[PDB]
Design an enzyme around this catalytic site. Structure first.
Site, mmCIF file in Angstrom:
data_model
loop_
_atom_site.group_PDB
_atom_site.id
_atom_site.type_symbol
_atom_site.label_atom_id
_atom_site.label_comp_id
_atom_site.label_asym_id
_atom_site.label_seq_id
_atom_site.Cartn_x
_atom_site.Cartn_y
_atom_site.Cartn_z
ATOM 1 N N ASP A 402 15.690 42.842 67.168
ATOM 2 C CA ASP A 402 17.070 42.814 67.405
ATOM 3 C C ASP A 402 17.833 41.697 67.843
ATOM 4 O O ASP A 402 18.973 41.101 67.476
ATOM 5 C CB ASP A 402 17.540 43.903 68.479
ATOM 6 C CG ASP A 402 17.108 45.323 68.230
ATOM 7 O OD1 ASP A 402 16.943 45.867 66.990
ATOM 8 O OD2 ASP A 402 16.890 46.286 68.764
ATOM 9 N N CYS A 436 23.505 42.529 54.285
ATOM 10 C CA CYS A 436 23.535 43.319 55.716
ATOM 11 C C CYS A 436 24.261 42.526 56.608
ATOM 12 O O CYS A 436 24.310 41.382 56.515
ATOM 13 C CB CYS A 436 22.385 44.199 56.172
ATOM 14 S SG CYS A 436 21.814 45.230 55.182
ATOM 15 N N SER A 437 24.838 43.180 57.791
ATOM 16 C CA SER A 437 25.498 42.269 58.796
ATOM 17 C C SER A 437 26.571 41.680 57.988
ATOM 18 O O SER A 437 27.368 42.241 57.122
ATOM 19 C CB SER A 437 24.425 41.454 59.632
ATOM 20 O OG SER A 437 25.009 41.094 60.877
ATOM 21 N N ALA A 438 26.877 40.405 58.395
ATOM 22 C CA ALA A 438 27.941 39.554 57.827
ATOM 23 C C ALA A 438 27.090 38.644 56.721
ATOM 24 O O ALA A 438 28.271 38.111 55.916
ATOM 25 C CB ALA A 438 28.433 38.370 58.869
ATOM 26 N N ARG A 442 20.278 36.172 58.545
ATOM 27 C CA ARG A 442 18.896 36.904 58.195
ATOM 28 C C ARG A 442 18.876 36.512 56.734
ATOM 29 O O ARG A 442 17.847 35.951 56.090
ATOM 30 C CB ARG A 442 18.653 38.229 58.474
ATOM 31 C CG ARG A 442 18.641 38.536 60.185
ATOM 32 C CD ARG A 442 18.434 40.054 60.235
ATOM 33 N NE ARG A 442 18.498 40.446 61.587
ATOM 34 C CZ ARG A 442 18.534 41.567 62.099
ATOM 35 N NH1 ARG A 442 17.988 42.427 61.865
ATOM 36 N NH2 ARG A 442 18.663 41.810 63.567
ATOM 37 N N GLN A 483 21.556 30.378 60.693
ATOM 38 C CA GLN A 483 22.577 30.516 61.860
ATOM 39 C C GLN A 483 21.986 29.752 63.111
ATOM 40 O O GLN A 483 22.732 29.220 63.841
ATOM 41 C CB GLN A 483 22.905 31.841 62.093
ATOM 42 C CG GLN A 483 24.025 32.512 61.335
ATOM 43 C CD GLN A 483 25.387 31.764 61.674
ATOM 44 O OE1 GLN A 483 26.028 31.844 62.756
ATOM 45 N NE2 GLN A 483 25.838 31.025 60.882
#
Ligand SMILES: Cn1cc(Cl)c2cccc(NS(=O)(=O)N3Cc4ccc(CN)cc4C3)c21
Length: 505
Positions: A402, A436-438, A442, A483
């Site tokens: 996470d 996925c996510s923004a 990842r 990131q």
């Protein structure tokens, strides 16, 4: 990117803004103990406010503001949208006047430690015409030296040479023995880049490209990870981040009112020049051509689409894109839910079931569980057109932690190896979708690893890789790809692991 100050404490930051800034002055800085934590320090009313910015790996989260793909994009956004940033009270904090750093330690051309022969030897072996660097003088502490290569890029024939230029430091200002005195090395370098020095006998000391030390042969990676592990990883990462000022390309289509509710986060947007354009839209729909997604083309070559997790109102657009681009393989980078929050919205049917998503139809033929991932065999077709059916293999990675990154890269590497062989087995398959996510953290990390191991798989040890150069090339096709410093180190660790398993083969 002068407003970023890498080696400053909070109290130092305050003193700079109070003594050398005015109301509206501002700077950003990192925490040294807590990587991924940043602070935006701002002057207002003759007092200093500090605003935290958190990155756990998916985006920069500004407390009291929005989420951003880079600190440069954050600064650009708030310097053009006043009233927009607020404190706890809700009062307005204006970013007007960047406060510039003089520290040169994050510049590509800065190599403080080099001696003259070691600099000559580096430029001799690794440089070409116009390769330059700046090092500290050993014989005069506080002074600096500029070393430059010049000559013919076609053995050691005498057609090239290294020149040295001494740089004095006098009352905190820098010069080359005449002319203008500069307030920092950056300003001196920038000036002679645009207006190169000429020797009386004609030679032009042109400053074209900083010395490259990150391009290395693949069998060198093992000893280079060792060097970088003794805060070298931090230095090299931050040097890369200071180049993001060069990647502020336009995102106008993603800012259209018609497109606002198609974006997970309003200011994390696709570059116009690489966005995926959807055709054959419902003729009624005013703007039917937008999805938050970009083509990644590495510069029989594999390409990718990097994209966000769906919104419930973009599920149909996601399937339009997979069908149009002929993609046959999808990688998901998060669970549906993490920390009790939605990270990747479910857009496929339950096992054995069939569903329609607008004009597209999907069957979930079979799920197979593995240790680190689930594979779903999907069949995609256009409603009313039987033999448009194709299989789409969806690889859902489920064990990414996470916060931060996996402690062992074996799971990710075994996953990409399987994803790679599926893609190669399907003739004329389109780009591999990664999401996925923004779709920047990842997603960027998986794509970069995949690019680098591909080179090593096709060539072997006898191949040059260059990790920061590769990331800069992918960050020019989608904002903020990779990131964090944890992700950056993970990429080196994954390449090292992959080499060492083939070196056992
Ligand atoms: C080759 N390349 C292209 C892009 Cl864009 C880029 C961004 C960052 C780093 C490199 N690699 S580099 O060889 O230029 N480089 C390694 C490194 C490490 C520490 C310092 C001290 N500040 C300086 C340097 C110089 C990049």
């Amino acid at each position: 990117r002068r407003w970023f100050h890498p080696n400053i404490t909070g109290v130092e930051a305050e003193n700079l803004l109070l003594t050398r800034g005015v109301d509206g002055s501002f700077l950003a800085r990192p925490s040294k103990s807590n990587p991924g934590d940043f602070t935006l320090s701002v002057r207002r009313n003759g007092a200093v406010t500090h605003i935290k910015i958190q990155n756990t790996g998916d985006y920069y989260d500004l407390y009291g503001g929005e989420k951003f793909a880079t600190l440069a994009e954050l600064v650009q956004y708030y310097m053009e949208h006043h009233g927009q940033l607020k404190e706890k009270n809700g009062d307005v904090i204006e970013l007007k006047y960047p406060l510039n750093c003089a520290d040169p330690t994050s510049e590509r051309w800065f190599h403080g430690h080099l001696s003259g022969k070691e600099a000559e030897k580096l430029l001799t072996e690794k440089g070409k015409h116009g390769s330059f660097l700046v090092r500290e003088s050993q014989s005069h502490p506080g002074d600096f030296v500029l070393s430059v290569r010049t000559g013919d890029d076609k053995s050691n024939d005498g057609k090239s040479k290294v020149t040295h230029v001494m740089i004095r430091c006098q009352e905190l200002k820098y010069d080359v023995g005449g002319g203008e005195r500069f307030d920092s090395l950056t300003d001196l370098v920038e000036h002679y880049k645009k207006n190169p020095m000429v020797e009386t006998l004609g030679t032009v000391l042109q400053l074209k490209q900083p010395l490259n030390t990150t391009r290395i042969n693949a069998a060198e990676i093992e000893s280079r990870v060792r060097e970088l592990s003794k805060q070298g990883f931090w230095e090299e990462f931050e040097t890369l981040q200071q180049q993001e000022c060069k990647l502020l390309y336009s995102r106008k289509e993603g800012q259209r009112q018609e497109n606002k509710n198609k974006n997970r986060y309003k200011n994390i947007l696709p570059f116009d020049h690489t966005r995926v354009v959807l055709h054959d839209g419902d003729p009624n729909e005013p703007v039917s051509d937008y999805i938050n997604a970009n083509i990644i083309m590495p510069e029989p070559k594999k390409s990718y689409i990097a994209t966000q997790g769906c919104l419930q109102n973009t599920v149909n657009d996601f399937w339009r894109m997979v069908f149009q681009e002929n993609s046959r393989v999808i990688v998901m980078t998060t669970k549906e839910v993490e920390r009790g929050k939605s990270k990747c919205v479910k857009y496929w049917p339950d096992e054995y079931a069939l569903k329609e998503y607008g004009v597209m139809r999907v069957r979930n033929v079979k799920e197979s569980a593995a240790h680190d991932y689930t594979l779903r065999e999907l069949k995609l077709s256009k409603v009313g057109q039987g033999n448009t059916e194709r299989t789409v293999w969806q690889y859902h990675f489920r064990t990414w932690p996470d916060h931060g990154v996996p402690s062992d890269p074996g799971g990710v590497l075994d996953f990409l190896e399987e994803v790679h062989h599926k893609q190669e087995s399907i003739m004329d398959a389109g780009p591999v979708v990664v999401h996925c996510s923004a779709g920047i953290g990842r997603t960027g990390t998986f794509i970069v690893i995949d690019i680098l191991i591909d080179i090593i798989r096709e060539k072997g040890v006898d191949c040059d890789i260059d990790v920061p150069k590769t990331i800069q090339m992918v960050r020019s096709q989608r904002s903020g790809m990779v990131q964090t410093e944890a992700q950056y180190r993970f990429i080196y660790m994954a390449v090292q692991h992959y080499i060492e398993t083939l070196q056992r083969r």
